[PDB]
Design a protein around this ligand. Sequence first.
Ligand SMILES: *[C@@H]1O[C@H](CO)[C@@H](O[C@@H]2O[C@H](CO)[C@@H](O[C@@H]3O[C@H](CO[C@H]4O[C@H](CO[C@H]5O[C@H](CO)[C@@H](O)[C@H](O)[C@@H]5O)[C@@H](O)[C@H](O[C@H]5O[C@H](CO)[C@@H](O)[C@H](O)[C@@H]5O)[C@@H]4O)[C@@H](O)[C@H](O[C@H]4O[C@H](CO)[C@@H](O)[C@H](O)[C@@H]4O[C@H]4O[C@H](CO)[C@@H](O)[C@H](O)[C@@H]4O[C@H]4O[C@H](CO)[C@@H](O)[C@H](O)[C@@H]4O)[C@@H]3O)[C@H](O)[C@H]2NC(C)=O)[C@H](O)[C@H]1NC(C)=O
Ligand SMILES: *[C@@H]1O[C@H](CO)[C@@H](O[C@@H]2O[C@H](CO)[C@@H](O[C@@H]3O[C@H](CO[C@H]4O[C@H](CO[C@H]5O[C@H](CO)[C@@H](O)[C@H](O)[C@@H]5O)[C@@H](O)[C@H](O[C@H]5O[C@H](CO)[C@@H](O)[C@H](O)[C@@H]5O)[C@@H]4O)[C@@H](O)[C@H](O[C@H]4O[C@H](CO)[C@@H](O)[C@H](O)[C@@H]4O[C@H]4O[C@H](CO)[C@@H](O)[C@H](O)[C@@H]4O[C@H]4O[C@H](CO)[C@@H](O)[C@H](O)[C@@H]4O)[C@@H]3O)[C@H](O)[C@H]2NC(C)=O)[C@H](O)[C@H]1NC(C)=O
Ligand SMILES: *[C@@H]1O[C@H](CO)[C@@H](O[C@@H]2O[C@H](CO)[C@@H](O[C@@H]3O[C@H](CO[C@H]4O[C@H](CO[C@H]5O[C@H](CO)[C@@H](O)[C@H](O)[C@@H]5O[C@H]5O[C@H](CO)[C@@H](O)[C@H](O)[C@@H]5O)[C@@H](O)[C@H](O[C@H]5O[C@H](CO)[C@@H](O)[C@H](O)[C@@H]5O)[C@@H]4O)[C@@H](O)[C@H](O[C@H]4O[C@H](CO)[C@@H](O)[C@H](O)[C@@H]4O[C@H]4O[C@H](CO)[C@@H](O)[C@H](O)[C@@H]4O)[C@@H]3O)[C@H](O)[C@H]2NC(C)=O)[C@H](O)[C@H]1NC(C)=O
Ligand SMILES: *[C@@H]1O[C@H](CO)[C@@H](O)[C@H](O)[C@H]1NC(C)=O
Ligand SMILES: *[C@@H]1O[C@H](CO)[C@@H](O)[C@H](O)[C@H]1NC(C)=O
Ligand SMILES: *[C@@H]1O[C@H](CO)[C@@H](O)[C@H](O)[C@H]1NC(C)=O
Ligand SMILES: *[C@@H]1O[C@H](CO)[C@@H](O)[C@H](O)[C@H]1NC(C)=O
Ligand SMILES: OC[C@H]1O[C@](O)(CO)[C@@H](O)[C@@H]1O
Ligand SMILES: OC[C@H]1O[C@](O)(CO)[C@@H](O)[C@@H]1O
Ligand SMILES: OCCc1ccc(O)c(O)c1
Ligand SMILES: OCCc1ccc(O)c(O)c1
Ligand SMILES: OCCc1ccc(O)c(O)c1
Ligand SMILES: OCCc1ccc(O)c(O)c1
Ligand SMILES: OCCc1ccc(O)c(O)c1
Ligand SMILES: OCCc1ccc(O)c(O)c1
Ligand SMILES: OCCc1ccc(O)c(O)c1
Ligand SMILES: OCCc1ccc(O)c(O)c1
Ligand SMILES: OCCc1ccc(O)c(O)c1
Ligand SMILES: OCCc1ccc(O)c(O)c1
Ligand SMILES: OCCc1ccc(O)c(O)c1
Ligand SMILES: OCCc1ccc(O)c(O)c1
Ligand SMILES: OCCc1ccc(O)c(O)c1
Ligand SMILES: OCCc1ccc(O)c(O)c1
Ligand SMILES: OCCc1ccc(O)c(O)c1
Ligand SMILES: OCCc1ccc(O)c(O)c1
Ligand SMILES: OCCc1ccc(O)c(O)c1
Ligand SMILES: OCCc1ccc(O)c(O)c1
Ligand SMILES: OCCc1ccc(O)c(O)c1
Ligand SMILES: OCCc1ccc(O)c(O)c1
Ligand SMILES: OCCc1ccc(O)c(O)c1
Ligand SMILES: OCCc1ccc(O)c(O)c1
Lengths: 624, 624
Amino acid sequence: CSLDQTVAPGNLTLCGNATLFTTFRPKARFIAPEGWMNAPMGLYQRADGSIHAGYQSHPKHIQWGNISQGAAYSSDFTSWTDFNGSEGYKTIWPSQIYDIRGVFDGSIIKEGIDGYPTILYTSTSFGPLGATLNEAEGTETQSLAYTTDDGASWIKLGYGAGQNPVIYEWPETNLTGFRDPYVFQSPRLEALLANTTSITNATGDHFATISGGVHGDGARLFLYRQHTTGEFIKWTYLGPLVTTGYKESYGEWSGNYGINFETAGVTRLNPAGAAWDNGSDTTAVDFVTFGTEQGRADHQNHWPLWAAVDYEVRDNGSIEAVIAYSGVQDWGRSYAYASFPVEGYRQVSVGWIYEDDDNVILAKQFGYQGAFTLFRDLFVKVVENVSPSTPGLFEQASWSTKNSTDGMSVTVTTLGQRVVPETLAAYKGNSTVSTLAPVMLNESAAAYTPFSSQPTDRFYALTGSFEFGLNTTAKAGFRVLASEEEYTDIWFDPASENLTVVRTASSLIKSFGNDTELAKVKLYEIVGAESKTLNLTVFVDGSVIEIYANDEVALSTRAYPWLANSTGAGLLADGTTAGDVVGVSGLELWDGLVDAWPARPANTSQGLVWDGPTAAMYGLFAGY
Amino acid sequence: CSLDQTVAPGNLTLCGNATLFTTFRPKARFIAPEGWMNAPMGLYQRADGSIHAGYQSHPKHIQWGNISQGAAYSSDFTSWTDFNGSEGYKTIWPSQIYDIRGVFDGSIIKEGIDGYPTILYTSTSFGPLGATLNEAEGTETQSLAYTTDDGASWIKLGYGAGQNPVIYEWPETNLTGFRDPYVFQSPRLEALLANTTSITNATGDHFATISGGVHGDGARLFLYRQHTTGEFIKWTYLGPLVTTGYKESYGEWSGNYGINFETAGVTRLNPAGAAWDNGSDTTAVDFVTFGTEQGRADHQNHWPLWAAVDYEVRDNGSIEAVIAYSGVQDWGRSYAYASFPVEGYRQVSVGWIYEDDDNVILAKQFGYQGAFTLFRDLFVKVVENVSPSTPGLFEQASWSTKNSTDGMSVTVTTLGQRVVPETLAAYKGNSTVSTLAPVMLNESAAAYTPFSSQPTDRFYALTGSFEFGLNTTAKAGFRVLASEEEYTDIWFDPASENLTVVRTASSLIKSFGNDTELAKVKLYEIVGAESKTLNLTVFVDGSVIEIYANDEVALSTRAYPWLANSTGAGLLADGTTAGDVVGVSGLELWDGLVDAWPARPANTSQGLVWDGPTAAMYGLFAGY
Ligand SMILES: *[C@@H]1O[C@H](CO)[C@@H](O[C@@H]2O[C@H](CO)[C@@H](O[C@@H]3O[C@H](CO[C@H]4O[C@H](CO[C@H]5O[C@H](CO)[C@@H](O)[C@H](O)[C@@H]5O)[C@@H](O)[C@H](O[C@H]5O[C@H](CO)[C@@H](O)[C@H](O)[C@@H]5O)[C@@H]4O)[C@@H](O)[C@H](O[C@H]4O[C@H](CO)[C@@H](O)[C@H](O)[C@@H]4O[C@H]4O[C@H](CO)[C@@H](O)[C@H](O)[C@@H]4O[C@H]4O[C@H](CO)[C@@H](O)[C@H](O)[C@@H]4O)[C@@H]3O)[C@H](O)[C@H]2NC(C)=O)[C@H](O)[C@H]1NC(C)=O
Ligand SMILES: *[C@@H]1O[C@H](CO)[C@@H](O[C@@H]2O[C@H](CO)[C@@H](O[C@@H]3O[C@H](CO[C@H]4O[C@H](CO[C@H]5O[C@H](CO)[C@@H](O)[C@H](O)[C@@H]5O)[C@@H](O)[C@H](O[C@H]5O[C@H](CO)[C@@H](O)[C@H](O)[C@@H]5O)[C@@H]4O)[C@@H](O)[C@H](O[C@H]4O[C@H](CO)[C@@H](O)[C@H](O)[C@@H]4O[C@H]4O[C@H](CO)[C@@H](O)[C@H](O)[C@@H]4O[C@H]4O[C@H](CO)[C@@H](O)[C@H](O)[C@@H]4O)[C@@H]3O)[C@H](O)[C@H]2NC(C)=O)[C@H](O)[C@H]1NC(C)=O
Ligand SMILES: *[C@@H]1O[C@H](CO)[C@@H](O[C@@H]2O[C@H](CO)[C@@H](O[C@@H]3O[C@H](CO[C@H]4O[C@H](CO[C@H]5O[C@H](CO)[C@@H](O)[C@H](O)[C@@H]5O[C@H]5O[C@H](CO)[C@@H](O)[C@H](O)[C@@H]5O)[C@@H](O)[C@H](O[C@H]5O[C@H](CO)[C@@H](O)[C@H](O)[C@@H]5O)[C@@H]4O)[C@@H](O)[C@H](O[C@H]4O[C@H](CO)[C@@H](O)[C@H](O)[C@@H]4O[C@H]4O[C@H](CO)[C@@H](O)[C@H](O)[C@@H]4O)[C@@H]3O)[C@H](O)[C@H]2NC(C)=O)[C@H](O)[C@H]1NC(C)=O
Ligand SMILES: *[C@@H]1O[C@H](CO)[C@@H](O)[C@H](O)[C@H]1NC(C)=O
Ligand SMILES: *[C@@H]1O[C@H](CO)[C@@H](O)[C@H](O)[C@H]1NC(C)=O
Ligand SMILES: *[C@@H]1O[C@H](CO)[C@@H](O)[C@H](O)[C@H]1NC(C)=O
Ligand SMILES: *[C@@H]1O[C@H](CO)[C@@H](O)[C@H](O)[C@H]1NC(C)=O
Ligand SMILES: OC[C@H]1O[C@](O)(CO)[C@@H](O)[C@@H]1O
Ligand SMILES: OC[C@H]1O[C@](O)(CO)[C@@H](O)[C@@H]1O
Ligand SMILES: OCCc1ccc(O)c(O)c1
Ligand SMILES: OCCc1ccc(O)c(O)c1
Ligand SMILES: OCCc1ccc(O)c(O)c1
Ligand SMILES: OCCc1ccc(O)c(O)c1
Ligand SMILES: OCCc1ccc(O)c(O)c1
Ligand SMILES: OCCc1ccc(O)c(O)c1
Ligand SMILES: OCCc1ccc(O)c(O)c1
Ligand SMILES: OCCc1ccc(O)c(O)c1
Ligand SMILES: OCCc1ccc(O)c(O)c1
Ligand SMILES: OCCc1ccc(O)c(O)c1
Ligand SMILES: OCCc1ccc(O)c(O)c1
Ligand SMILES: OCCc1ccc(O)c(O)c1
Ligand SMILES: OCCc1ccc(O)c(O)c1
Ligand SMILES: OCCc1ccc(O)c(O)c1
Ligand SMILES: OCCc1ccc(O)c(O)c1
Ligand SMILES: OCCc1ccc(O)c(O)c1
Ligand SMILES: OCCc1ccc(O)c(O)c1
Ligand SMILES: OCCc1ccc(O)c(O)c1
Ligand SMILES: OCCc1ccc(O)c(O)c1
Ligand SMILES: OCCc1ccc(O)c(O)c1
Ligand SMILES: OCCc1ccc(O)c(O)c1
Ligand SMILES: OCCc1ccc(O)c(O)c1
């Protein structure tokens, strides 16, 4: 196996385990030391102000199995430190009959058992498990563990009656799934249910949703309420919070609701961030975020979605969350978004970016799979003075509209997402920053124009504001990870409203995915403006390309160019003329970003292992 | 719930958990501190000379489940001390995917992993498990753990390829069972296989048997050999050692071979005890001991058997153990006999005595289930100068015969069992000993004659030699645990060759078993003698009645009299006349025995617990 990145790649399947560990590996984001990772879990801000982040983890393997919580902490979302205990960087693992098949996703009760931070997690045991299989009651249950050392270790409650698992009865029959308990406090829901507590006897200050669905009849988000304040064993099922139809779609801007929900959460936001009012703040909006399964032909059959909801109180003392408008949290190769409260009235969200090696051709050669997205502040995005002539505006698909008194302007409201400012500040401060001159893309524009300053490696950020004519048919954007022979093209086409990532030339290595990514972007036209603007930021981090548009649209994807010099970047232009011009300003390159794991060496592989012939006998895990 | 033992018992099912803990509980033998126990396991003499005894254990429950190794140690087989660690008296428990369903029986490699004592045990996982069910490969595997602290704790090898479990492939298809690995060294088998090691490549100094059977085709004992000396991962299957037919019986003296073996072991004995020769000792005999399932209408469908075997070497470098004669290790309510080597050329055996409460009516009220038998030295019993006119002698059912040169006398050989002398010495020395005058039971004998000295509680031993006429039709024996209203009768009837325990009056409490126990006893008549003798020893220990006859026949059973004064004992006589007399001599009562657990208080209950609704969902354990 040759690792010569100045010539064409050979047969890389002949390479040994973890021989490509550093080749495509992100350096500026959250990632496990080695092996398999997927969903974020157990996210909380600790009493000292630091952030605890857990993740679904299978060390020394490159496929899912024995799924455990790996963990680390950070003071700024950006530079991280691994926990290191008796099980290395793991802090919760399968150990009891009720969770031996996997410690699935869970969330944090900040003041729980004996006042300690407490995780409510899906404990899995034997039997078919999946939305397309005939799952039985007991296979997925919900269990508690608490930490007396700020997340270095967790103590599970004992197995048995009145102890773990604490939630095991299916609330409705024939479930497709029953997992990912999301614990939260809600002055809003407490106020709404206050006149119904005689019906249910549930009066606790914590709620929990469990994600699932019903066979043949669509996804479900089940709402529970803590029965009594200060007591954590008894959780009372109120009713279904979100009910969607079998492979129902709200439209082109909204993905598809599939057959089963995963990793669903509930929050309330206002224009500044997190909202803690009871309903009295008229600017605040209730949101649900959730993954869906089997409503998509690609992207591992997975949509990470969100919806703004209006709560209605049922006669039986439960809540119906009626979808008002519905969108997509990320349009690319990411899933399993978790959100959590942070000091200063913030709600922060983070997801999992999977690889684009679905046939598992080079996974062993990597010696790892997966990374996190960047951490994102959620808020209510408000756009004022929107022109009613904005095409398709009143369809209100993933946004709401409110007319002015005179009907001549509109206020648009939607879900906002932006990278946490701690990360942006650290990235910019540690990078070599080049502020680039603005460019008019007209008849003289080449198809590709390299920036006047270039990156030095695969770790950089780009930003730019693209100003388009209201009736433009021109396309523009950014090319990244670019040499003459390999490059990844990020295009926006205002006429179609499509943001695409074309990956036909992303790599000489043909086993990686090369399909075109697509996001819809609505450019809300402002009253009196003769142009419309796309603010586009791109993070390039090893193989991750993470794109943000107008603090609204996110698209995470993967590119794995072989050649050492496939690091360049610049501007893309198509159909720009003397008449149809695209103006580009606010251009900056941040070269280098941040070393997110300063204590880790470059190669943190510990080798890979095989579970042996019994993996196939048990039939639970691939075994490698 | 009244505990007044001076009046009739009330409805004892209304009594609370462990309220009858001390009422019927043995005090002079090995028993768990509380809860469920069954099979002995992990038996070895430690480097300091003490005995380590493990047992199948489920604390705080009175039915089987989460089965673990409880453990204790003793310098003399008699007075014991519990281990006490992080899991109380447990030292191995379900903790990994491969053993989460139960840590079943296992045995000791004395110099194993890194030179430490090492247990090879049956690690069980999910799926149907049992001789009458459709078990699949993987559900029962064999795994290693080693101890660096003389049995206070055990470290399992890691899960995976080249590690645990170390034996997982079924050696033949459609097994009824695949468990209870019995590790042993055998100069005999090494010598026999020495010319075949090129065929198999197995040259290690340890052998292991695994107990099981084949569906519809009888029980099997599978022989493995350690592949290489000093290496413990690789064990090579040679072939079936013992093969018996579906519910085959060798006869009235031999129980029934059932459908499946459990807890089988292999040893070699001579007249003094254990034999370590290669075949050169002409007085030594090869033995297999084994439990059988589903060959019996009662006694939990379980026979604890043994067989003398003659080894034949197969062409494929394996051993066939051909049954020469076949007997019963204990005729009563015991099973799961394990044997192990002890210093001074001894092989010591011990089993499990279950309760006689099969409908589980008072198990919660007890707060425990089960005890061990006494520890027994095994040896080759040789009887010289046997008369050829001994009825049925030449059928050689559970014994062999060898004629003298002149054909006028016979040497009889069979399996001998006797209580270890350490226990007998301790029992006698700590007891109030009454040596009783000999008695002629004739026309003047009452049906029951109390001994001139009486026991003071339910903890005592009796011994006596009963001399019968060669053509007697009289019966005699011992009555124990006796008041006017409750008593247990132990009879020998030489005309039928039946030793019985009649339990119709054993207790006023009707939920306990009251069926008659039966053992066959051959009185080998000596040349020139005008009488035949039964030497009978009885241990009474709470509810245990353990009977030994002629260092050959053992019968363990249970009696649970309610009344406080149902402790008496004496002689039984039936059909004794002036002409048909039974002489009784060597009569002794040992009142008190020994406190086998001096550090334990009288009540070591920790309460009982319920596993909750998930027990039924998982379907593995009863849950209580
Ligand atoms: C099959 O069998 C297995 C094995 O038996 C079963 O698994 C066992 O199940 C039992 C019973 O549930 C568990 O016992 C509990 O243990 C926890 C502590 O767990 C932690 O610590 C253990 C011991 O640590 C020590 O030894 C280790 C090893 O040498 C060493 O590393 C360590 O440094 C230390 O020296 C660890 O072994 C254990 O690890 C295991 O579990 C981890 C996950 O938790 C896992 O990651 C590991 O890999 C490993 O598997 C873990 O770290 C005890 O806290 C708990 O005792 C509390 O709860 C019971 C009630 O059920 C109560 O009786 C006790 O009194 C106690 O409750 C008091 O304290 C609480 C905490 O402070 C408090 O909240 C309570 O309110 C209560 O407080 C009382 O006192 C205060 C005054 O102080 C007063 O104010 C209050 O009013 C009140 O009176 C149990 O003992 C075992 O941990 C577990 N073991 C394993 C190995 O799995 C399995 O369940 C069985 N399966 C089936 C199907 O049956
Ligand atoms: C799902 O995930 C779970 C969790 O990750 C998996 O379970 C884990 O699996 C791993 C991997 O197999 C195990 O790691 C091994 O651990 C043993 C030690 O185990 C004991 O000690 C652990 C740590 O103890 C410390 O912390 C605890 C807790 O705070 C504390 O109580 C204690 O005081 C101490 O401070 C215990 O946690 C562990 O308890 C667990 O297991 C018990 C049963 O064993 C159970 O009863 C408990 O309830 C609990 O569950 C236990 O007590 C290590 O010895 C071992 O490391 C050796 O082996 C590997 C090879 O695989 C090798 O890389 C290492 O270098 C090392 O081998 C060297 O040392 C050996 C021993 O001396 C020697 O024999 C070797 O030859 C080798 O020697 C080398 O060095 C010498 C020089 O010294 C040289 O001469 C030689 O040539 C050579 O170079 C592993 O690290 C985990 O224990 C296990 N954890 C749990 C909680 O279960 C699970 O398998 C996964 N499931 C699936 C399906 O994937
Ligand atoms: C002393 O030691 C003890 C440890 O041993 C310790 O703990 C106690 O342990 C004992 C066991 O030894 C525990 O006793 C058991 O308790 C169980 C639970 O009882 C509660 O739940 C029952 C079942 O609930 C389902 O069904 C109901 C009726 O259909 C519904 O109303 C429910 O909604 C629920 O339905 C859900 O689940 C279904 C599947 O199960 C599903 O189909 C359905 O769709 C839905 O999802 C209730 O029936 C029960 O209610 C009765 O009892 C309470 C309390 O007494 C009363 O207040 C009520 O009015 C009502 O009468 C409880 O709410 C029991 O299920 C279990 O019963 C079994 O065993 C007993 C005795 O043998 C039988 O009478 C019974 O028939 C059951 O037998 C079972 O076995 C057979 C075969 O052997 C099996 O085929 C059959 O189906 C069944 O499985 C048993 O009584 C006890 O709970 C523990 N108590 C604790 C932990 O506190 C104890 O504490 C120690 N003491 C001290 C002082 O320390
Ligand atoms: C980059 O490397 C390739 C392969 O060695 C080479 O052909 C090319 O000249 C280099 N420079 C570029 C594309 O700017
Ligand atoms: C570089 O990054 C670190 C880690 O995130 C951060 O704390 C530091 O402030 C950054 N340096 C700057 C902004 O100069
Ligand atoms: C034993 O106790 C019972 C019940 O109290 C009583 O009837 C009897 O007289 C006592 N003594 C005996 C049987 O010797
Ligand atoms: C009493 O029993 C103990 C424990 O078995 C034993 O060590 C001791 O020798 C006995 N006492 C005698 C024989 O006097
Ligand atoms: O690893 C298991 C976890 O990952 C998810 O499937 C999301 O992709 C969760 O629903 C589950 O808790
Ligand atoms: O508890 C399980 C153990 O008990 C037995 O069934 C004997 O009765 C063994 O075969 C097994 O190892
Ligand atoms: O202890 C639960 C604290 C909490 C409050 C609000 C949330 O949205 C949440 O995820 C957790
Ligand atoms: O279970 C009572 C112990 C406890 C101590 C401190 C707390 O803040 C708490 O909520 C509970
Ligand atoms: O694999 C069949 C799973 C299944 C379970 C319940 C249903 O109602 C169904 O349609 C399918
Ligand atoms: O379904 C379990 C019933 C139960 C509830 C609370 C307890 O403390 C208990 O022991 C059993
Ligand atoms: O008194 C008004 C505060 C007010 C406005 C809206 C609400 O939903 C509420 O609970 C309180
Ligand atoms: O809603 C106030 C915050 C906000 C952030 C980014 C935007 O693009 C916007 O229009 C509003
Ligand atoms: O064909 C799109 C129809 C139409 C025009 C303008 C809008 O704001 C709208 O909602 C629909
Ligand atoms: O929505 C298309 C018609 C229209 C109505 C009101 C306006 O202010 C406008 O600019 C266009
Ligand atoms: O000024 C260049 C950006 C731009 C392009 C097209 C326009 O119609 C416009 O107003 C601005
Ligand atoms: O969503 C991209 C964020 C962004 C914000 C402001 C800008 O000027 C920009 O170029 C990008
Ligand atoms: O869309 C405006 C982009 C732009 C601004 C100022 C300039 O000088 C330019 O060349 C382009
Ligand atoms: O380390 C195994 C020692 C051993 C020798 C002979 C036996 O019969 C035995 O059970 C163990
Ligand atoms: O694995 C080599 C370690 C070892 C040390 C001492 C021994 O007696 C032994 O058999 C092995
Ligand atoms: O429950 C059916 C178990 C079974 C397995 C294999 C067989 O050959 C058989 O006869 C029965
Ligand atoms: O069947 C497992 C093959 C294998 C044998 C020995 C090993 O050390 C190993 O890693 C795999
Ligand atoms: O040389 C005789 C020793 C001898 C007799 C019988 C045997 O089986 C043996 O191995 C050696
Ligand atoms: O085989 C010598 C030992 C032995 C012990 C007890 C007996 O009853 C016997 O006949 C021989
Ligand atoms: O009916 C029993 C037949 C018989 C008599 C004496 C014996 O030793 C024998 O083996 C068979
Ligand atoms: O076996 C019954 C006939 C018999 C043969 C030889 C004897 O020495 C004897 O006592 C009886
Ligand atoms: O001496 C009383 C015992 C005994 C009973 C019957 C006999 O035939 C005998 O020889 C001895
Ligand atoms: O098998 C009962 C043991 C025993 C041996 C010698 C005796 O004198 C006796 O009465 C009992
Ligand atoms: O079987 C002989 C029993 C016995 C021996 C001596 C006696 O004095 C007696 O009365 C009974």
